[PDB]
Ligand binder design. Structure first.
Ligand code: DZS
Length: 483
C-alpha cells in the first residue's frame, strides 16, 4: 500500500495531522505546493514535525540528507527497513505511515458522475466484475458494479465521517470499504455475487481522438491521471538483490537505483552483472544507465552478447558541469579495445538534434564476429524539464526505427541516459506507442498509463515526472497529426 502519500494537503495540514493523529515515527509524503514538481516527507520526531524536501528534475528522486531513488515507494520501503540511514546530522526514523483517507487517486473513484453515465461507461468499457465509486446524486457515495449482463448500484452512506452500505461494519475511508467488499463480496437476495474484480478503465482511448483527451487533460487533469498511475507503483516492489551484492555495489551509478532481478540483463567470481533490464512491449529494448569507468567493458560485453545494433543515448556526456555518461566509444576514425571487445568509430554524422556514430564492434582474436553498431546521440534535451516541441524527439525516433528495421535479426535497442529511468523511460514509452500507430494505423486503442505501468514492471521508475508524462501525450498527439 501507498496510503502514506497524501495528494491534496498543505504543509500546515500535514503538521496538524501528524501532531493530532500521529506519534513519534509517524510520517507522510505529499506534493510541494511552493515548488510544483517536487515532494515533501513530513516526519514526527520528539514531539516536533520535520519537512524533508524530495526533488525530481526528471532523472530520479533526490532526498535531501538521504539518497537517490527510482520511486517514492522504493524510498519508503528502504527507509522503513534500514534505520539510521536518514539524517544537523541526527537520525530520522520512518516507523508509522500516516494513512490518507482521500479516494482521489484510486483507479475506481470517479467523483462527480451520474448513475446514467456510470451505466453508459460500464456498458461500453466494463466487463464482469468491473466497478466504480461515484458521489451521490447527497454527500454520500454509490458503488456501481457490472456482472454477467447487468449493472447494480449500492448506496454508500457517509455518517459521522464513516462509511457503510446500510448495515454491518462502518469504515474510516472509502478504500477500507472497497477492499473489504473485494474480499467479502456482497450477495443480492436472489444469489447474485457482486464481485469487485477490477476497476473500470478510464484511460484507454482511440488514437484518432488524442486531441480531445489532451484538451480535456489540459483543463490539471494530467496531474490527477499521473498521480493515479503513481499510486500503482506499490505493486512493483520486485526483488533487486543482485544489485545489492558487495561485488556489484560500485557497478551502480546510484547505490539505491537497481535493476529488477527477474528482468536484469545477465552477462555470460562475479562477472554477470550490469545495471540494465530487458524491456519487452506487452522490437525490444535494453534500458540501462550511462557507463561508469569500471562498467565500460561490461557495457560492450552486453551489446555484443544481446546482438544489439542500435544504441540511443539520451543525454550529453556532461550536463550542468556533471558527468551524465562517460565516453565509452573511440574518437572518429580511432580503434580501441575495451577488454575482450574491439571498437572502431567508422564515421560521425551531425544532425540538428543529434549525432550519429557508425561503430564496428568485434571480439578480440575473432574477425568473423564483427557487426556495425549505430549510436544515435540525442544532444538537445534541455537541462531541466522536457522539450517545448516534440518534433525533434519524433524525427530522431523515426530514424532509429528505420535503422533498426533495416537490420536482419538485430537484437534489442539499447537506450541509456544517466540513471537509465527518466529520459530512457520517456523515449521507450513514446517509441512503443508510436510503434502501435505504425502497425494498426490511427484506428487503434492506446492506453498511456497502462503502457507506462507495463514498462515500470520491467525496470523501476521508468518515466519520472508529470512533465515527462505530458510530453509522451504531446509526442503521441504530434505523430498522429503528421499522419
Ligand atoms: O528477497 C526477496 O525476494 C525480495 C522481494 C521483494 C523485494 O522488494 C526485495 C528487495 N529488493 N530490494 C529491496 N530493497 C532495496 C535495497 C536494499 C538494500 C540495499 C539497497 C537497496 Cl535499493 C529494500 O529496501 C527492501 C526492504 C524491505 C523488503 C525488501 C526490500 N528489497 C527482495
Amino acid at each position: 500500500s501507498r496510503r502514506w502519500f497524501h495528494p491534496n494537503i498543505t504543509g500546515v495540514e500535514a503538521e496538524n495531522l501528524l501532531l493530532t493523529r500521529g506519534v513519534d515515527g509517524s510520517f507522510l509524503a505529499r506534493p510541494s505546493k511552493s515548488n510544483p514538481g517536487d515532494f515533501t516527507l513530513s516526519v514526527r520526531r520528539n514531539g516536533a514535525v520535520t519537512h524533508i524536501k524530495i526533488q525530481n528534475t526528471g532523472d530520479y528522486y533526490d532526498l535531501y540528507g538521504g539518497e537517490k531513488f527510482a520511486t517514492l515507494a522504493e524510498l519508503v520501503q528502504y527507509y522503513m527497513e534500514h534505520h539510521g540511514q536518514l539524517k544537523n546530522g541526527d537520525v530520522i526514523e520512518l516507523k508509522y505511515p500516516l494513512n490518507c483517507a482521500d479516494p482521489t487517486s484510486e483507479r475506481w473513484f470517479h467523483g462527480h458522475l451520474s448513475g446514467k453515465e456510470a451505466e453508459k461507461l460500464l456498458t461500453e468499457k466494463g466487463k464482469h466484475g468491473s466497478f466504480l465509486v461515484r458521489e451521490s446524486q447527497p454527500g454520500d457515495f454509490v458503488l456501481s458494479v457490472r456482472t454477467g449482463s447487468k449493472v447494480t448500484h449500492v448506496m454508500i452512506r457517509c455518517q459521522e465521517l464513516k462509511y457503510d452500505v446500510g448495515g454491518g461494519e462502518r469504515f474510516d475511508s472509502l478504500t477500507d470499504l472497497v477492499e473489504h467488499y473485494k474480499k467479502n463480496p456482497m450477495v443480492e437476495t436472489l444469489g447474485t455475487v457482486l464481485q469487485l474484480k477490477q476497476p473500470l478503465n478510464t484511460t484507454r482511448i482511440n488514437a484518432a481522438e488524442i486531441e480531445s483527451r489532451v484538451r480535456e487533460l489540459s483543463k490539471q487533469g494530467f496531474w490527477e491521471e499521473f498521480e493515479t498511475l503513481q499510486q500503482q507503483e506499490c505493486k512493483l516492489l520486485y526483488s533487486r538483490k543482485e544489485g545489492q551484492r558487495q561485488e556489484n555495489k560500485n557497478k551502480n551509478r546510484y547505490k539505491n537505483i537497481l535493476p529488477f532481478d527477474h528482468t536484469r540483463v545477465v552477462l555470460h567470481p562475479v562477472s554477470d552483472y550490469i545495471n540494465a533490464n530487458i524491456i519487452m512491449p506487452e522490437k525490444s529494448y535494453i534500458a540501462t544507465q550511462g557507463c561508469l569507468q569500471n562498467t565500460v567493458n561490461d557495457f560492450w560485453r552486453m551489446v555484443f552478447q544481446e546482438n544489439s545494433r542500435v544504441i540511443v543515448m539520451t543525454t550529453k556526456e556532461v550536463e550542468r558541469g556533471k558527468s551524465k555518461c562517460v565516453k565509452y566509444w573511440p574518437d572518429e576514425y580511432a580503434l580501441k579495445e575495451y577488454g575482450v571487445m574491439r571498437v572502431r568509430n567508422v564515421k560521425e554524422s551531425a544532425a540538428h538534434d543529434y549525432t550519429l556514430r557508425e561503430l564496428k564492434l568485434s571480439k578480440v582474436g575473432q574477425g568473423n564476429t564483427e557487426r556495425t553498431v549505430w549510436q544515435y546521440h540525442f544532444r538537445t534535451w534541455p537541462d531541466h524539464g522536457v522539450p517545448s516541441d516534440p518534433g525533434g524527439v519524433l524525427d530522431f525516433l523515426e530514424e532509429v526505427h528505420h535503422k533498426q528495421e533495416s537490420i536482419m535479426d538485430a537484437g534489442p535497442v539499447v537506450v541509456h541516459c544517466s540513471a537509465g529511468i527518466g529520459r530512457t523511460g520517456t523515449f521507450i514509452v513514446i517509441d512503443i506507442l508510436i510503434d502501435i500507430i505504425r502497425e494498426k494505423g490511427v484506428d487503434c486503442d492506446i492506453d498511456v498509463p497502462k503502457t507506462i505501468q507495463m514498462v515500470r514492471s520491467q525496470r523501476s521508475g521508468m518515466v519520472q515526472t508529470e512533465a515527462q508524462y505530458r510530453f509522451i501525450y504531446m509526442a503521441v498527439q504530434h505523430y498522429i497529426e503528421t499522419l
